[PDB]
Amino acid sequence: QIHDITGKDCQDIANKGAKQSGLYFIKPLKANQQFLVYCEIDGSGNGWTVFQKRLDGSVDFKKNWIQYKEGFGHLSPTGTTEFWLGNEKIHLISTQSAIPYALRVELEDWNGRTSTADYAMFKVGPEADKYRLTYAYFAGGDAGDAFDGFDFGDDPSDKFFTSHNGMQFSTWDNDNDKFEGNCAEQDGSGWWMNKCHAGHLNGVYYQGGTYSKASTPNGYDNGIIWATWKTRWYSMKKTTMKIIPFNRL
Numbered sequence: 001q002i003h004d005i006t007g008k009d010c011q012d013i014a015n016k017g018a019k020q021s022g023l024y025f026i027k028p029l030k031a032n033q034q035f036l037v038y039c040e041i042d043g044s045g046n047g048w049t050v051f052q053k054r055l056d057g058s059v060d061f062k063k064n065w066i067q068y069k070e071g072f073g074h075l076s077p078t079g080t081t082e083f084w085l086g087n088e089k090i091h092l093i094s095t096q097s098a099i100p101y102a103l104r105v106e107l108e109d110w111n112g113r114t115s116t117a118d119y120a121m122f123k124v125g126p127e128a129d130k131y132r133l134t135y136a137y138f139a140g141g142d143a144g145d146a147f148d149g150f151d152f153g154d155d156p157s158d159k160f161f162t163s164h165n166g167m168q169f170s171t172w173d174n175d176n177d178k179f180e181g182n183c184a185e186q187d188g189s190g191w192w193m194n195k196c197h198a199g200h201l202n203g204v205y206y207q208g209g210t211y212s213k214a215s216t217p218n219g220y221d222n223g224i225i226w227a228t229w230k231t232r233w234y235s236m237k238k239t240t241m242k243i244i245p246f247n248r249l
């Protein structure tokens, strides 16, 4: 169920001997209390700390500010459950000791195809700054750089409106996006919204992947999308968001 070795993150845990993916307790520099996390440990001593997992539609991601801050969903020793670790926890881990962390987004098709996109020096700011997302540069991966924005063809400024670097976090009850409307409320989720998104992993779980403007009453493209890999009308089967010290790349 829960393992004995502890550390500041899952890589520290892997450095002390652990070799099994599962549940562990970690306690980041500024964390006043230790908390449970799911570590993904491979055969090379890499220990990834997982903060988001989607895989079957068992959890509703339309949650409020406090819920996204504190975390929701279920942690499993087998890693077969959906959850959002919580913004406060993501902030403590990603910023401890100025350690440079890499973010890996892992996506899976309804056809079995898996792809990734890595971001170097990933950080999530404090609540005072609405848990802002920042990264140095896109490090590569076959899923493409959706965080850089995308020209959907709706408006000439599409790319400027869909990039995510520097965006604050938004929920339906705490709008901090760059839109006249409320992106989080119209989509029904919590995310680093601009106006509104090119990459959005906290969307509605559409069975089968393919969906359309007809699926929803207003025709919003509110699924689990990553524009640089699949069409905005294609919703992912599984997603994983995880972090590890940059030197482990």
Ligand SMILES: [Ca+2]
Pocket (backbone or CB within 6 Å): 175, 176, 177, 178, 179, 180, 181, 182, 183
């Ligand atoms: Ca707004």
